[PDB]
Amino acid sequence: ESADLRALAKHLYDSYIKSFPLTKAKARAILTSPFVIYDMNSLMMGEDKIKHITPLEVAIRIFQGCQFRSVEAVQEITEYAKSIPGFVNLDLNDQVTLLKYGVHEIIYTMLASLMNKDGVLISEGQGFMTREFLKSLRKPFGDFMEPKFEFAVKFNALELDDSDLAIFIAVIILSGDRPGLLNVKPIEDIQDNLLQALELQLKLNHPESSQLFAKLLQKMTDLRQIVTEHVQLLQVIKKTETDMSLHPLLQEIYKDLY
């Protein structure tokens, strides 16, 4: 029933607004004034002007900035997943497995909302770190962000809004082919109805773009690959890199990821 799918779409958009303080609409409104970090000197100036708390090399520091952002993103995503009808019924083991494999895919999806072709909103939109600077970084740090920027440029061309993204994100979380799932049957059934809600959502909200649903689902596999390539580049520098020690939440997520 179309109306039951419009009621699922509305519930997810309402929960998405409640779960994610920096939405794409606010991000677009800003990107169209945050402190611009574009080189070494503007970075050092930036973190005194500007979302990092602890007891106390630039590449490592920026990396710990992103880690800190991740940990809070997982918390928003977890609070959002819990509102997806039927998620809090799945085998608690499988809730954990969906979270585990879904959380970075959502992070990069929502990171695209904060990106344009030249940089990214940081620290809830009070900063803007340039793509060039991120690329200029040394060793393998200059390659962390670049695939995200390339994904975001293509993904942002779809012109999804937050109401679109609320269902797309939910579709991603409820993937039935995550390694180690116990009960894939009720997960696929939840996902199947989210996909119907997404499809109706895209035909109502984007009547003019044919095959947007098709283009969107192909992006889902892009996201999986981005995370897989990040997993490895993370395991690359856990050998050379002496100064990095991943946040506990993140080393738990990454543990036997890929």
């Binding site: 608690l92 954990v96 979270l99 585990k100 738990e252 997520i253």
Partner: peptide
């Protein structure tokens, strides 16, 4: 799964 991932479980708990 649930054995490992205590941090995930506790975010899911409430």
């Amino acid at each position: 799964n649930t054995k490992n991932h205590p941090m995930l479980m506790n975010l899911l708990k409430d």
